[PDB]
Design a protein around this ligand. Sequence first.
Ligand SMILES: [Cl-]
Ligand SMILES: [Cl-]
Ligand code: NA
Ligand code: NA
Ligand code: NA
Ligand code: NA
Length: 325
Amino acid sequence: TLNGGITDMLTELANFEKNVSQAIHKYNAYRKAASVIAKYPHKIKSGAEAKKLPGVGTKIAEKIDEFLATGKLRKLEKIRQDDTSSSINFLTRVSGIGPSAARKFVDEGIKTLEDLRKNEDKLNHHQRIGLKYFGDFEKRIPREEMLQMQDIVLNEVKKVDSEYIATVCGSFRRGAESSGDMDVLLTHPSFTSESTKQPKLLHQVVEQLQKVHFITDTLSKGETKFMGVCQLPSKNDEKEYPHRRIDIRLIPKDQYYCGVLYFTGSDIFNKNMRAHALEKGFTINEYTIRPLGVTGVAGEPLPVDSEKDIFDYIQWKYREPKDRS
DNA sequence: GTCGG
DNA sequence: GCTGATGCGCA
DNA sequence: CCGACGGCGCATCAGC
Ligand SMILES: [Cl-]
Ligand SMILES: [Cl-]
Ligand code: NA
Ligand code: NA
Ligand code: NA
Ligand code: NA
């Protein structure tokens, strides 16, 4: 909205650094800059003004000045006019094709989707699936569909064993009106960090979701993490639903609620909570909450039976998922 | 590229 | 065949 | 001035 020219420009620069230059820290720098600018409540009028924001430095300020003056950036013009840079950047839009493979493909004249289709023998399993659902994977998922996907997963999980707990996390859990993908955290009383009393806990859930044809493809699967593809059922009269990315993570019960907290977010919420935790004095990561001794040494993980427990340890008023943004 | 020891 | 490294996508 | 900047599970490759 406000400053959309600027954040688009910074996002384009971010993608170039990640995909072409293979410079992940500059990607994140541009991304951090675009994000802070996006949340600034005035239309930026100079590079100097932008520089007051954390994560906007000297070089980005100069680019903002150039963009405000000219309505474009010469650096991006050049980048866009270079066949190699734009093709590499484009190929990375395929799931399974990262900066390294995009460069390899382009070096041998594989530059477009059509080129990829003709050379499917040069693609791995993940890449073929990314190619197959290229368009579908770029569509967001409206909340109404997420709600419908939730019913199917929570239902099928219950059917395999009543004692599984499954929670759909992400922005969705915070009430978002659309999601990028579905992230499901799964646990079971038999699975703890102490020992595994029962094998194939994840596999039986994945298998059941395949049985009812909700899961259609597998990008990867091991003991603790599944990554794949799913699709809502449609009516015979009606248009088919897009295929969607689904991840399911099996987490030990004693770490489950720290997991839910972490994977619910937001990033900025987690960040603030971790800092306030640190001065109370606890350390919170994805897995545990541990007290810090006088010397700054973490002790043993504390017992967590719910998300609220974590909030209590650091004497923080519980915040419902939709208030974490 | 930006930041903080 | 084995082990460790790298690519990939992911809060 | 100089190194940090999430870091982890799985698939696949490199190097034996
Ligand atoms: Cl970098
Ligand atoms: Cl831990
Ligand atoms: Na700044
Ligand atoms: Na990609
Ligand atoms: Na820092
Ligand atoms: Na080999």
